[PDB]
Design a binder for this molecule. Structure first.
Ligand SMILES: CC[C@H]1CCCC[C@]1(O)C(=O)C(=O)N1CCCC[C@H]1C(=O)O[C@H](CCc1ccc(OC)c(OC)c1)c1cccc(OCC(=O)O)c1
Length: 128
């Protein structure tokens, strides 16, 4: 499925090139530039365990997820990934536990040492 496609075809977007965060652009965004650090970003996402089991989706509450980019308000893979996106883009990310919830996890739904799949749609962003 989609996780396996990222494993097989994904671009390594980490600074360390350790395959910790892998990305495929699924829909090219029409936006010109990536958001700046600090900007308010508006996203819709689907989150799955590596095995494909759904754990959360913003589409279940019909509400975009909103955070400030690059401020450590979310897991490291998200700060890394969203920073590479343009407005309107949908990407798939595969995130090793070092760049997500590590040995601690996010219990009960996310276990220790989980590799996570996310589809992120960058709906919009506004300058810090
Ligand atoms: C099973 C995970 C669910 C649980 C219900 C809320 C969303 C959820 O956390 C999720 O789907 C998720 O895994 N997210 C949410 C979308 C952004 C990516 C990821 C996330 O970073 O969530 C943070 C978790 C807290 C966090 C923050 C910073 C971290 O590193 C610096 C970090 O590392 C382990 C962990 C998040 C942020 C804000 C709100 C939130 O949940 C809603 C709430 O608390 O009101 C969850």
């Amino acid at each position: 499925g989609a996780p396996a496609t990222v494993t097989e075809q994904g671009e390594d977007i980490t600074s360390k090139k350790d395959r910790g965060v892998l990305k495929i652009v699924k829909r090219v965004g029409n936006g010109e530039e990536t958001p700046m650090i600090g900007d308010k970003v508006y996203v819709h996402y689907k989150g799955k365990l590596s095995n494909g089991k759904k754990f959360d989706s913003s589409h279940d509450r019909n509400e975009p997820f909103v955070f400030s980019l690059g401020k450590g308000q979310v897991i490291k893979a998200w700060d890394i990934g969203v920073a590479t996106m343009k407005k309107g883009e949908i990407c798939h990310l595969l995130c090793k536990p070092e760049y997500a919830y590590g040995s601690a996890g996010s219990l009960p739904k996310i276990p220790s040492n989980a590799t996570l799949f996310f589809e992120i749609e960058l709906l919009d962003f506004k300058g810090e």
